[PDB]
Coordinates of C-alpha atoms in Angstrom, one line a residue:
Chain A
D1 CA 42.9 2.7 9.3
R2 CA 45.2 2.0 6.8
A3 CA 48.2 1.0 9.5
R4 CA 45.6 -1.4 11.3
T5 CA 44.8 -3.1 7.7
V6 CA 48.6 -3.2 7.5
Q7 CA 49.1 -5.0 11.2
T8 CA 46.0 -7.5 11.4
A9 CA 47.5 -8.5 7.5
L10 CA 50.8 -9.3 8.7
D11 CA 49.1 -11.6 11.8
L12 CA 47.0 -13.4 9.6
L13 CA 50.3 -13.8 7.1
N14 CA 52.3 -15.3 10.4
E15 CA 48.9 -17.4 11.1
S16 CA 48.0 -19.3 8.1
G17 CA 50.6 -18.1 5.2
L18 CA 50.8 -16.1 1.9
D19 CA 48.8 -18.3 0.4
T20 CA 45.7 -18.2 2.3
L21 CA 46.0 -14.4 2.4
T22 CA 42.7 -12.7 0.4
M23 CA 41.0 -9.6 0.8
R24 CA 38.3 -11.3 2.1
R25 CA 40.1 -13.6 4.8
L26 CA 41.2 -9.7 6.0
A27 CA 37.8 -8.5 6.1
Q28 CA 36.8 -11.8 8.0
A29 CA 39.5 -11.4 10.5
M30 CA 38.8 -7.2 11.0
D31 CA 34.9 -7.8 11.1
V32 CA 34.4 -5.4 7.9
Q33 CA 33.1 -5.9 4.7
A34 CA 35.7 -7.0 1.7
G35 CA 34.3 -3.6 0.2
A36 CA 35.6 -1.4 3.0
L37 CA 39.0 -2.7 2.6
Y38 CA 38.7 -2.0 -1.2
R39 CA 38.3 1.9 0.4
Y40 CA 42.0 1.6 1.7
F41 CA 43.7 -0.7 -1.1
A42 CA 43.0 -0.1 -5.0
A43 CA 44.2 -4.0 -5.2
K44 CA 45.7 -6.8 -2.6
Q45 CA 48.7 -6.2 -4.9
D46 CA 48.5 -2.2 -3.1
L47 CA 48.8 -4.2 0.6
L48 CA 50.7 -6.8 0.2
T49 CA 53.4 -3.6 -1.5
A50 CA 52.2 -1.7 2.2
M51 CA 53.3 -4.9 4.1
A52 CA 56.8 -4.9 2.1
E53 CA 57.4 -1.5 2.8
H54 CA 56.2 -1.7 6.4
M55 CA 58.3 -5.0 7.1
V56 CA 61.3 -2.7 6.3
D57 CA 61.4 -0.2 8.8
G58 CA 64.5 0.6 9.9
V59 CA 66.4 -1.4 8.0
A60 CA 68.9 1.5 6.3
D61 CA 69.5 2.5 10.3
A62 CA 71.2 -0.9 10.9
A63 CA 74.2 0.4 8.9
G64 CA 74.5 3.3 11.9
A65 CA 77.4 5.9 11.1
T66 CA 80.7 6.4 9.6
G67 CA 82.9 4.8 12.0
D68 CA 80.6 1.9 13.2
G69 CA 82.8 -0.8 11.8
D70 CA 84.4 -0.3 8.5
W71 CA 82.5 -0.3 5.1
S72 CA 82.4 -4.1 4.9
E73 CA 80.4 -4.3 8.1
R74 CA 78.2 -1.6 8.1
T75 CA 77.4 -3.3 4.3
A76 CA 76.7 -7.0 6.3
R77 CA 74.6 -5.7 8.7
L78 CA 72.1 -3.9 6.4
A79 CA 72.6 -7.4 4.5
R80 CA 72.0 -8.9 7.8
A81 CA 69.0 -6.9 8.9
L82 CA 67.0 -6.8 6.1
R83 CA 67.0 -10.9 5.9
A84 CA 65.9 -10.2 9.7
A85 CA 63.3 -8.4 8.9
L86 CA 61.8 -11.0 6.2
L87 CA 62.6 -13.7 8.8
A88 CA 60.6 -11.7 11.1
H89 CA 57.3 -12.3 9.0
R90 CA 55.7 -16.0 7.7
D91 CA 56.4 -15.9 3.6
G92 CA 58.0 -12.3 4.3
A93 CA 60.9 -13.1 1.7
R94 CA 57.9 -13.7 -1.0
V95 CA 56.1 -10.5 0.3
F96 CA 59.1 -8.5 -0.6
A97 CA 60.2 -10.0 -3.6
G98 CA 56.9 -9.8 -5.3
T99 CA 56.3 -5.9 -4.7
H100 CA 55.1 -3.5 -6.9
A101 CA 56.3 0.3 -5.1
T102 CA 59.6 1.3 -4.0
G103 CA 58.3 3.0 -0.7
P104 CA 60.2 5.3 1.1
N105 CA 61.9 2.5 3.9
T106 CA 63.3 0.5 0.8
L107 CA 64.5 3.5 -0.3
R108 CA 66.8 4.4 2.4
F109 CA 67.8 1.1 2.6
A110 CA 69.3 1.0 -1.0
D111 CA 70.7 4.6 -1.0
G112 CA 72.1 4.1 2.5
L113 CA 73.9 0.8 1.0
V114 CA 75.2 2.4 -1.7
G115 CA 76.5 5.3 0.0
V116 CA 78.1 3.2 2.2
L117 CA 80.4 1.8 -0.6
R118 CA 80.3 5.3 -2.6
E119 CA 82.0 6.6 0.4
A120 CA 84.5 4.3 1.0
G121 CA 85.6 4.5 -2.6
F122 CA 84.1 2.1 -4.9
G123 CA 83.3 4.3 -7.8
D124 CA 79.2 4.8 -9.1
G125 CA 78.9 1.3 -11.4
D126 CA 80.1 -0.4 -8.5
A127 CA 78.7 0.7 -5.9
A128 CA 75.3 0.2 -7.5
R129 CA 75.7 -3.0 -9.1
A130 CA 76.9 -3.9 -5.6
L131 CA 73.2 -2.9 -4.1
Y132 CA 71.6 -5.2 -6.7
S133 CA 74.0 -8.2 -5.6
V134 CA 74.0 -7.8 -2.2
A135 CA 69.8 -7.3 -2.1
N136 CA 69.4 -10.2 -4.8
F137 CA 71.1 -12.8 -2.7
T138 CA 70.1 -11.8 0.3
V139 CA 66.2 -12.0 -0.8
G140 CA 67.2 -15.1 -2.8
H141 CA 68.8 -16.9 0.4
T142 CA 65.4 -16.0 2.6
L143 CA 63.2 -16.9 0.0
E144 CA 64.6 -20.6 0.0
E145 CA 65.0 -20.3 3.7
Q146 CA 61.6 -19.7 4.3
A147 CA 60.5 -22.4 1.4
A148 CA 62.4 -24.9 3.4
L149 CA 60.9 -24.1 6.5
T150 CA 57.1 -24.2 5.0
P151 CA 55.4 -27.5 6.8
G152 CA 56.5 -30.0 4.5
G153 CA 59.8 -27.9 2.8
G154 CA 60.2 -26.8 -0.4
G155 CA 62.6 -24.8 -2.8
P156 CA 65.2 -27.1 -5.1
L157 CA 67.7 -27.2 -2.5
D158 CA 66.0 -28.2 0.4
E159 CA 68.4 -29.6 3.3
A160 CA 65.8 -32.8 3.8
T161 CA 64.7 -33.5 0.6
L162 CA 68.6 -33.8 -0.8
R163 CA 69.5 -36.4 2.0
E164 CA 67.2 -38.9 0.7
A165 CA 67.7 -38.2 -3.1
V166 CA 71.0 -38.7 -2.7
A167 CA 73.8 -41.3 -2.4
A168 CA 77.4 -41.9 -2.7
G169 CA 77.1 -43.7 -5.7
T170 CA 75.2 -41.3 -7.8
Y171 CA 75.7 -37.7 -6.6
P172 CA 78.9 -37.9 -4.5
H173 CA 80.2 -34.5 -3.8
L174 CA 76.1 -34.1 -2.2
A175 CA 77.1 -37.5 -0.4
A176 CA 80.0 -36.1 0.5
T177 CA 78.8 -32.7 1.8
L178 CA 75.5 -33.8 3.1
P179 CA 76.5 -33.0 6.6
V180 CA 76.5 -29.0 5.2
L181 CA 73.4 -29.4 2.8
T182 CA 71.2 -30.6 5.3
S183 CA 72.2 -28.4 8.2
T184 CA 69.7 -26.1 9.5
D185 CA 72.5 -23.7 10.1
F186 CA 71.2 -21.2 7.5
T187 CA 72.9 -18.1 9.5
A188 CA 75.9 -19.7 8.6
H189 CA 74.8 -20.3 4.8
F190 CA 74.2 -16.9 4.8
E191 CA 76.6 -15.5 6.4
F192 CA 79.2 -17.4 4.4
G193 CA 78.0 -15.9 1.3
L194 CA 77.7 -12.7 2.6
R195 CA 81.7 -12.8 3.0
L196 CA 82.1 -14.0 -0.4
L197 CA 80.4 -11.1 -1.4
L198 CA 82.3 -8.6 0.4
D199 CA 85.6 -10.4 -0.6
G200 CA 84.5 -10.1 -3.9
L201 CA 83.4 -6.2 -3.0
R202 CA 87.5 -5.4 -1.7
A203 CA 89.3 -7.5 -4.5
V204 CA 87.0 -5.0 -7.2
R205 CA 87.4 -1.7 -5.0
Chain B
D1 CA 51.5 -37.7 -21.5
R2 CA 52.7 -36.7 -18.5
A3 CA 55.4 -35.2 -20.7
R4 CA 52.9 -33.6 -23.5
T5 CA 51.1 -31.7 -19.8
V6 CA 54.5 -30.5 -19.1
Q7 CA 55.0 -28.6 -22.4
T8 CA 51.4 -27.4 -22.8
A9 CA 52.0 -26.0 -19.1
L10 CA 55.1 -24.9 -20.1
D11 CA 53.4 -23.2 -23.4
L12 CA 50.9 -21.5 -21.5
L13 CA 52.9 -20.5 -18.8
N14 CA 54.7 -18.3 -21.9
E15 CA 51.0 -16.9 -23.2
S16 CA 49.7 -15.5 -19.9
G17 CA 52.0 -15.9 -16.7
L18 CA 52.2 -18.3 -13.9
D19 CA 49.0 -16.3 -12.0
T20 CA 46.7 -17.5 -14.3
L21 CA 47.8 -21.0 -15.1
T22 CA 45.6 -23.1 -13.4
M23 CA 44.2 -27.1 -13.6
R24 CA 41.2 -26.1 -15.4
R25 CA 43.4 -23.8 -17.9
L26 CA 45.5 -26.5 -18.9
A27 CA 42.8 -28.8 -19.0
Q28 CA 40.4 -26.4 -21.0
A29 CA 43.9 -26.1 -22.9
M30 CA 44.7 -29.6 -24.2
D31 CA 40.6 -30.2 -24.7
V32 CA 40.2 -33.0 -21.6
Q33 CA 38.3 -32.7 -18.2
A34 CA 40.5 -31.3 -15.2
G35 CA 39.6 -35.2 -13.4
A36 CA 42.1 -36.4 -16.3
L37 CA 44.9 -34.2 -15.4
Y38 CA 44.6 -35.0 -11.4
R39 CA 45.3 -38.6 -13.0
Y40 CA 49.0 -37.7 -13.7
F41 CA 49.3 -35.3 -11.3
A42 CA 47.9 -35.3 -7.9
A43 CA 48.5 -31.5 -7.4
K44 CA 49.5 -28.4 -9.2
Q45 CA 52.4 -28.2 -7.4
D46 CA 53.3 -31.5 -8.9
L47 CA 52.7 -30.1 -12.2
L48 CA 54.7 -27.0 -11.4
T49 CA 57.6 -29.1 -9.5
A50 CA 57.9 -31.0 -12.8
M51 CA 57.5 -28.2 -15.1
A52 CA 60.8 -26.5 -12.9
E53 CA 62.9 -30.1 -12.8
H54 CA 62.5 -30.1 -16.9
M55 CA 63.3 -26.4 -17.2
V56 CA 66.9 -26.8 -16.3
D57 CA 67.2 -30.1 -18.4
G58 CA 71.0 -29.9 -19.5
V59 CA 71.8 -27.1 -16.9
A60 CA 74.4 -29.6 -15.5
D61 CA 76.2 -30.2 -18.7
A62 CA 77.1 -26.4 -19.1
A63 CA 80.0 -26.9 -17.1
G64 CA 81.6 -29.3 -19.7
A65 CA 84.5 -31.7 -19.3
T66 CA 87.6 -30.6 -16.6
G67 CA 89.8 -28.5 -18.5
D68 CA 87.1 -26.8 -20.5
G69 CA 87.8 -23.1 -18.7
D70 CA 89.1 -23.3 -14.9
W71 CA 86.9 -23.6 -12.3
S72 CA 85.8 -20.5 -12.0
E73 CA 84.7 -20.2 -15.4
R74 CA 83.1 -23.7 -15.1
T75 CA 81.2 -22.6 -11.6
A76 CA 80.2 -19.4 -13.7
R77 CA 78.5 -21.6 -17.2
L78 CA 76.8 -23.6 -14.6
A79 CA 75.1 -20.1 -13.3
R80 CA 74.4 -18.7 -16.4
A81 CA 73.3 -21.8 -18.0
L82 CA 70.9 -22.2 -14.5
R83 CA 69.9 -18.4 -14.9
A84 CA 69.2 -18.8 -18.6
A85 CA 67.0 -22.0 -18.5
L86 CA 64.9 -20.0 -15.9
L87 CA 64.7 -17.0 -18.2
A88 CA 63.7 -19.1 -20.9
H89 CA 60.3 -19.3 -19.6
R90 CA 58.0 -16.5 -18.2
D91 CA 58.1 -16.6 -14.2
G92 CA 60.6 -19.7 -14.6
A93 CA 62.5 -18.4 -11.8
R94 CA 59.0 -18.1 -9.7
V95 CA 58.1 -22.0 -10.5
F96 CA 62.2 -23.4 -9.8
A97 CA 62.2 -21.1 -6.7
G98 CA 58.8 -22.3 -5.1
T99 CA 59.5 -26.3 -6.4
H100 CA 58.1 -29.6 -3.7
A101 CA 61.0 -31.9 -4.9
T102 CA 64.5 -32.1 -5.8
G103 CA 64.4 -33.7 -9.5
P104 CA 67.2 -36.1 -10.8
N105 CA 68.0 -32.3 -13.1
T106 CA 68.7 -30.2 -10.5
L107 CA 70.4 -32.8 -8.5
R108 CA 73.3 -33.0 -11.2
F109 CA 73.1 -29.7 -11.2
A110 CA 74.4 -29.3 -7.6
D111 CA 76.6 -32.0 -7.6
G112 CA 78.5 -30.8 -10.5
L113 CA 78.7 -27.3 -9.5
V114 CA 80.0 -28.8 -6.0
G115 CA 82.2 -31.3 -7.9
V116 CA 84.0 -28.3 -10.0
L117 CA 85.1 -26.7 -6.5
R118 CA 85.9 -29.8 -4.5
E119 CA 87.9 -31.0 -7.7
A120 CA 89.9 -27.8 -7.7
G121 CA 90.7 -27.6 -4.2
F122 CA 87.8 -26.4 -2.0
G123 CA 87.0 -28.5 1.5
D124 CA 83.9 -29.8 1.5
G125 CA 82.2 -27.0 3.6
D126 CA 83.6 -24.4 0.8
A127 CA 81.5 -26.4 -1.7
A128 CA 78.4 -27.3 -0.4
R129 CA 78.1 -23.4 1.1
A130 CA 79.2 -22.2 -2.1
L131 CA 76.0 -24.2 -4.1
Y132 CA 74.0 -22.4 -2.2
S133 CA 75.3 -18.7 -2.4
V134 CA 75.6 -19.2 -6.2
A135 CA 72.6 -21.0 -6.6
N136 CA 70.3 -18.3 -4.4
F137 CA 72.0 -15.6 -5.8
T138 CA 71.3 -17.2 -9.1
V139 CA 67.5 -17.5 -8.2
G140 CA 66.7 -14.4 -6.8
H141 CA 68.5 -12.4 -9.3
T142 CA 66.3 -14.3 -12.4
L143 CA 63.2 -13.4 -9.7
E144 CA 63.5 -9.8 -10.0
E145 CA 64.8 -9.4 -13.3
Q146 CA 61.7 -11.4 -14.4
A147 CA 59.5 -9.6 -11.8
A148 CA 61.1 -6.2 -13.9
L149 CA 60.2 -7.4 -17.1
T150 CA 56.4 -8.6 -16.1
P151 CA 54.0 -5.8 -17.9
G152 CA 54.1 -2.8 -15.2
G153 CA 57.0 -3.6 -13.6
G154 CA 57.3 -4.9 -9.9
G155 CA 60.1 -5.6 -7.8
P156 CA 61.8 -3.7 -4.7
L157 CA 64.4 -2.5 -7.2
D158 CA 62.3 -1.9 -10.3
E159 CA 64.9 0.3 -12.5
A160 CA 61.9 1.9 -13.7
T161 CA 60.3 2.4 -10.0
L162 CA 63.6 4.2 -8.9
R163 CA 63.8 6.7 -11.1
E164 CA 60.7 8.5 -10.4
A165 CA 61.4 8.4 -6.5
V166 CA 64.3 9.6 -6.9
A167 CA 65.7 12.8 -6.4
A168 CA 69.9 13.9 -5.3
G169 CA 67.9 16.2 -2.7
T170 CA 66.5 12.9 -1.1
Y171 CA 68.2 9.7 -2.3
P172 CA 71.9 10.7 -3.3
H173 CA 73.5 7.9 -3.9
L174 CA 71.0 6.6 -6.0
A175 CA 70.2 9.6 -8.0
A176 CA 74.1 9.9 -8.5
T177 CA 74.0 6.5 -9.9
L178 CA 70.7 6.2 -11.7
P179 CA 72.3 5.6 -15.3
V180 CA 73.4 1.5 -13.7
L181 CA 70.2 1.4 -11.5
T182 CA 67.9 1.9 -14.3
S183 CA 69.7 -0.1 -16.5
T184 CA 68.0 -3.1 -18.5
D185 CA 70.9 -4.5 -18.9
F186 CA 70.3 -7.5 -16.8
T187 CA 73.4 -9.5 -18.0
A188 CA 76.0 -7.2 -16.8
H189 CA 74.4 -7.3 -13.7
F190 CA 74.3 -11.0 -13.2
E191 CA 78.2 -11.1 -14.1
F192 CA 79.3 -8.6 -11.7
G193 CA 77.9 -10.6 -8.8
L194 CA 78.9 -13.3 -10.5
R195 CA 82.0 -11.8 -10.6
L196 CA 82.0 -11.0 -6.6
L197 CA 81.1 -15.0 -6.0
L198 CA 84.1 -16.3 -8.1
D199 CA 86.5 -13.7 -6.2
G200 CA 85.2 -14.2 -2.7
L201 CA 85.7 -17.8 -3.5
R202 CA 89.2 -17.3 -4.7
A203 CA 90.0 -15.6 -1.6
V204 CA 88.6 -18.7 0.6
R205 CA 90.3 -20.8 -1.2

């Protein structure tokens, strides 16, 4: 019932986006009274929190076992799986980024990531700080990727938006690099940023 | 008039946050009819876009001139100044992250950052991709920092939230690193992630 409500809400999210997702809209979708939904979720933020926790089901398992790649490969698989889980839902990064509890799925992901680094010889401080760096980069990247793919675009560095504002005469470095900036290859951008973080971790180990 | 409206909106933002900022609330604040505001801003997203562009005024100047530190120091100053500009306003990262145009202030920041890297010997692709990595990490980090400082907390890896869910018996790597995870030293976390990115750039140069 809670589970079915979460699934319906995720369906609605894909259909018309986060901004249109209301408890009333969800009630209309399930042919119940909004009153009913409020018995399962005290507030919309509780529903959103449950959605975010469901979206990341299985993310922690992306690391596999020790030996399934070196620490940098396993760390990369965790970050990629988090990105993929958020991209699987329209406005998914916004839902995850705005969540008001940390559930078991997220805790397993965080513990797993910190564990991979500690077991590979990173000290406590480096491993915990790396969790925040990797997670915050992944969320920031995915938020901006999803903003760009939203009908009409969005985000401060939206590919298409950059192109029209730019000239070599006024923003020459943006003009010179326009093919890359306006690339729809978000995956390549993500991999590059992840590579920077992992190279940086190699340097600090 | 547009400028005064933007300032009033930023004032309101600090007072009660992004979720309560409405065109009607802004109209009440300026003792005008909402109709009036819609003559200056066709939609609330246009106001938000103008707010975001104003928040980052002067960010691009953080890089200073060539020689004012090496490329890594100038790149770090740009990222720090962006973070600081968003932290200066309640929910500032949310406003910036959700913007629907790329104005001159943001373009100058982006062009300046890419320019610092190109002039230091990075190829076009690396410099442009680095812009996205640094900006997306900075935005993701600041979004999550602001979520945590919001009355009641928030964000998937909120310091306080982590503490209560964790035991050494169930999330041992989180338990072991709890001092760091629950640290209110967001600045230290930011500097660490920035260091990772810059070390990674040193590696790829």
